[PDB]
């Protein structure tokens, strides 16, 4: 239905937590970006202090096409010593484990969602991932895992395929490139049946991923956990398709929690009577990573 109608008893975290407790709320989609990994020591872009601050072009595809050495250097620099998912990754894991997660759609390539125990099935890595890597040569397309790719990115040798010696590229989507087919397929099916859109650590500037929020049904509540409001229709572009409205008198289903996503998710977890379960998972999984 396209009838706009209010399912949250009020436009707050508690309203959403209640909504989540309700029977109406069976299938949750998360949309995430760099905000949920910032605290795992991986910079985002739009953050003032880290991001696009020696070398935007280092992720356009044509620049990578001409000169790929700049990219592989950056990835040595940003390449973390240890991969601990965040509280907000683990919150997503809880949703899986309670059978609430229909899907997590993610712009992040860091692979943390998998490390937290989301499975390929749970995950639309709409911007690809570092998890896997392939030769660029059509006639080869030999596949490589993250250990082989790290050894190269840390050795400071441009990765070259062992069978044919083409450039071996991580399975990320560069700017310019097309998203995976799986993204559109999952998009067609998923957004019919979503009961709640949970939006974390994304500015929603990157298309087509941003437009996902308008593919939700109009009475699907949408919660944004973020440092800044994001997704509001621009005063000027709208002038000339289902954007965030948190504040107007017409606002009926969108809610904004502004802060760190670790606190936000930790708050929400608490309303749901999940805080102990979350605390234990995070503490337990990090310990296990620490013992690896």
């Amino acid at each position: 239905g396209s009838q706009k109608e209010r399912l949250l008893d009020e436009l707050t975290l508690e309203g959403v937590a209640r909504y989540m407790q309700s029977e109406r709320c069976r299938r949750v989609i998360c949309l995430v970006g760099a905000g949920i990994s910032t605290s795992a020591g991986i910079p985002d872009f739009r953050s003032p202090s880290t991001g696009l601050y020696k070398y935007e072009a280092i992720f356009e595809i044509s620049y990578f096409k001409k000169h790929p050495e700049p990219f592989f250097a950056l990835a040595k620099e940003l390449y973390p010593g240890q991969f601990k998912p965040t509280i907000c990754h683990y919150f997503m894991r809880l949703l899986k484990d309670k059978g609430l997660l229909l899907r997590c759609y993610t712009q992040n390539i860091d692979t943390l969602e998998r490390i937290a125990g989301l499975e390929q099935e749970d995950l639309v890595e709409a911007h690809g991932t570092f998890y896997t890597s392939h030769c660029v040569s059509a006639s080869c397309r030999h596949e490589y895992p993250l250990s082989w790719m790290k050894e190269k990115i840390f050795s400071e040798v441009t990765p070259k395929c062992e069978d044919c010696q083409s450039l071996v590229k991580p399975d990320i989507v560069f700017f310019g490139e097309s998203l995976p087919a799986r993204f559109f397929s999952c998009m067609q099916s998923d957004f019919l049946k979503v009961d709640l859109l949970l939006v974390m650590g994304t500015s929603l500037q990157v298309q087509p991923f941003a437009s996902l929020i308008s593919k939700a049904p109009l009475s699907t509540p949408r919660l944004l956990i973020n440092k800044e409001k994001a997704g509001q229709s621009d005063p000027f572009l709208g002038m000339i398709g289902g954007g965030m409205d948190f504040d107007s008198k017409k606002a009926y289903r969108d809610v904004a929690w502004l802060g760190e996503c670790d606190q936000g998710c930790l708050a929400l977890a608490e309303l749901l009577g999940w805080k102990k379960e979350l605390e234990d998972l995070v503490r337990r999984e990090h310990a296990s990573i620490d013992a690896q």
Binding site: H127, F175, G176, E177, S178, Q207, P208
Partner: peptide, 7 residues
């Protein structure tokens, strides 16, 4: 089906 881009 567009390709990744800023906006």
């Amino acid at each position: 089906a567009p390709r990744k881009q800023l906006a």
